[PDB]
Design a protein around this nucleic acid. Sequence first.
RNA 1: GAACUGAAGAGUUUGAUCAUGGCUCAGAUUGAACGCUGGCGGCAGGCCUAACACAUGCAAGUCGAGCGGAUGAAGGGAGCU
Length: 154
Amino acid sequence: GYIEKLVQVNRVAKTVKGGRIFAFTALTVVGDGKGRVGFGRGKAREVPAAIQKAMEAARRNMIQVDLNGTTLQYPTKSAHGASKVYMQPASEGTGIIAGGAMRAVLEVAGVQNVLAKCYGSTNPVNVVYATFKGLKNMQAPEAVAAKRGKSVEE
RNA sequence: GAACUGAAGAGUUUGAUCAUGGCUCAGAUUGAACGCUGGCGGCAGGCCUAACACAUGCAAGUCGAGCGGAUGAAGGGAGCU
Ligand SMILES: [Mg+2]
Ligand SMILES: [Mg+2]
Ligand SMILES: [Mg+2]
């Protein structure tokens, strides 16, 4: 998949004798818009190098997400650290009602109707972890049918 | 056949980081007031304060087919003119 979103770019510093060394960190998300999505972090002493490292890292470790035709299966509630995330499917006319990192993640993954919200700390990287944790543990029918036959469970 | 369908975050504590936590901002509303500016129309609204004191007009009268009385037309005439 090839859809690049630059979620965040930040400048960090470390102290040595002489003064400070500055570094640049980038967090990006990659996906095809039809089920696969991954995220990557990259640090360098230059912004382009950090962004390229983040893109290369995100292009690895992609995951497959089960979705109901550009729409979620059921409401989801997922947490990582101090960040908490609520999601729930919406109708066709809706867009993406989400803020910041969540919007990039959901748009990249390929869902178009998400009506989402976040509570707790709104650190973008932790929000991205929480959003992938919610999206990855999404079952969808014919997999919850491990118990018994299908069309009777629903 | 309908009577609903719906939820965004950002800045700021550090050399840098995560968390906690307060402050501030982006929206929608007023019986509003003030500053600058000002063409027209339709529909509404207009003492939120002193239940403070009030000049002057008007805002509750009608019935003569309930009853006496006094006001007494036009006319028919009568006299004198
Ligand atoms: Mg907080
Ligand atoms: Mg500083
Ligand atoms: Mg009054």
